[PDB]
Symmetry: D2
Subunit: 119 residues, 4 copies
Amino acid sequence: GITGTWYNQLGSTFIVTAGADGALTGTYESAVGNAESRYVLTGRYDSAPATDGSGTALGWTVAWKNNYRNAHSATTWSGQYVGGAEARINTQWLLTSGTTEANAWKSTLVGHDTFTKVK
Amino acid sequence: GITGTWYNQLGSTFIVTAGADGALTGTYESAVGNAESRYVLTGRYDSAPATDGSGTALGWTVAWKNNYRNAHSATTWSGQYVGGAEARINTQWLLTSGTTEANAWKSTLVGHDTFTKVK
Amino acid sequence: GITGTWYNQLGSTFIVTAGADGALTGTYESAVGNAESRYVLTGRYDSAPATDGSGTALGWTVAWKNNYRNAHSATTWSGQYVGGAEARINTQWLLTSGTTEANAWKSTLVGHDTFTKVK
Amino acid sequence: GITGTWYNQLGSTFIVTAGADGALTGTYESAVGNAESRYVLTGRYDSAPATDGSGTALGWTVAWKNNYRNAHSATTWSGQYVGGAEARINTQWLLTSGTTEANAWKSTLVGHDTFTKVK
Ligand SMILES: O=C(O)CCCC[C@@H]1SC[C@@H]2NC(=O)N[C@@H]21
Ligand SMILES: O=C(O)CCCC[C@@H]1SC[C@@H]2NC(=O)N[C@@H]21
Ligand SMILES: O=C(O)CCCC[C@@H]1SC[C@@H]2NC(=O)N[C@@H]21
Ligand SMILES: O=C(O)CCCC[C@@H]1SC[C@@H]2NC(=O)N[C@@H]21
């Protein structure tokens, strides 16, 4: 029930398939930034989703490289799937770009994203 | 040259193999926290490493679930491999645990790690 | 126009007064967590608010200590006041608790908050 | 014992005076970035420092504005003073710049700093 075609508040598309062991595959099309295509993602999530009423912890990784453009950067999301009547995924994310060792302090960006299934 | 057996400042072990397309596989044994084994990791990195003199951006994901213990949590690293005479990987990371919707604010932890190849 | 009585999505109250030089004073009552009173905050913001159409960058600090309860912790917000028809303040924040040197990795928590003036 | 003249790993200077109530005043000269002077800081820390053996939680705020240059940005540190034979302050920090509402995702930067008293 974690697989599907999620959107978020910036408008970017996140097509995902969960795995039997805990794998996470799919593509990710950022609607904003230095990117124009679907990009490859990979990540993991636990499969024992703590049935007391909590959300399923998950995380994944995208590196901004394909046939069209490269930004030499990588972004990781970590969040929790809150699954109920409103299927929601709240994530918080990092973005690291490849900089020179002088510009090491300003490499990382942080932010948040709210993923909804049927927009 | 990104593959290998890295340690860090907490003492945890990170066995990694890079990929021809940009995949990243291997295991991760946290020496601290609610974990006792090697755990499965998966992530990505770009393969056009920007030969002006910058580091290679990379990121990966571990979900704390195996045959021994489960913490219902997932952690993601994003950083850059600085490769020279001293092979170094500086990463900054998030840790998300599966909480109830009341305790949504205190789910995520942030921190930093400094990975060295030959300790 | 930054001064006033803001609420947020968790329900916590943030009473603030800006300064002529750039100071920021007021109180902060967290509606959730290990706190029960108004707490003291202090922070800063720039006063040249970049009239091209951007938001005003700001930040502040609260330490969870008063006559009622102490948590030995400190939280800092950094965000930007987007001021228009809908007066909004989006912030992203850190929370650090005083831990032993063994438990240094799990001290910091990260999160986000969305402040609205008239709720 | 928190007051004094701290340096860090980037070379920036942090002159600080603690307060009887819990206030924190002083100046901050960033040795790197879009800044050239001492800048004004303000923040807070708790004064009941948990004498079991933990560090003192603290945090502060700087807004990059003075007579010389303005960057329309604000940075906040949150960390813990580990005080022993080696007086250390480990902090983790955010940096928010005033951007247009389109460029809201890439406003914030995250990073870490390690402050030492006698360098
Ligand atoms: O910044 C870059 O170098 C490329 C653009 C990255 C897009 C970011 S990644 C996190 C955030 N969420 C998105 O869907 N897109 C932005
Ligand atoms: O907190 C948990 O629920 C399990 C322990 C997680 C270990 C964390 S993950 C990030 C940091 N780096 C490590 O090598 N271990 C800790
Ligand atoms: O965790 C603690 O030790 C005390 C509770 C802190 C409340 C946090 S601070 C950030 C977030 N925003 C709020 O208005 N409250 C929570
Ligand atoms: O980026 C800017 O707009 C101005 C430069 C800010 C300097 C940053 S703030 C955090 C980090 N620690 C420092 O001592 N300097 C950098």
